[PDB]
Amino acid sequence: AKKVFKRLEKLFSKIQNWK
């Protein structure tokens, strides 16, 4: 569907892994 928007939030979590 067009609700990949959720994956976007998961991307933010990736930032925490890099920090």
Could you characterize the architecture of this molecule?
This protein is rod-shaped. It has one helix at residues 5-18. The protein is built from one helix and no strands.
Notable characteristics:
monomer, 19 residues, mainly alpha, 74% helix, 0% strand, antibiotic, coil-helix-coil, Ribosomal protein, rRNA-binding, monomeric
Topology diagram in text:
Blueprint: H1 5-18
Give the structure's gist in a few sentences:
With 19 residues, the chain is mainly alpha-helical. It has one helix spanning 5-18. The chain is built from one helix and no strands.
Number of helices: 1
Number of strands: 0
What general form does the structure show?
A: rod-shaped
What sequence of helices (H) and strands (E) makes up the elements? H
Helical residue percent?
Answer: over 70%
Structural class: mainly alpha
Describe the main β-sheet briefly.
none
**Rg, Cα atoms, Å:** 10 Å
* End-to-end gap: 31 Å
What fraction strand?
under 5%
PDB class: antibiotic
Keywords: coil-helix-coil, Ribosomal protein, rRNA-binding, Antibiotic
Assembly: monomeric
Entry title: Structure of Antimicrobial Peptide, HP (2-20) and its Analogues Derived from Helicobacter pylori, as Determined by 1H NMR Spectroscopy
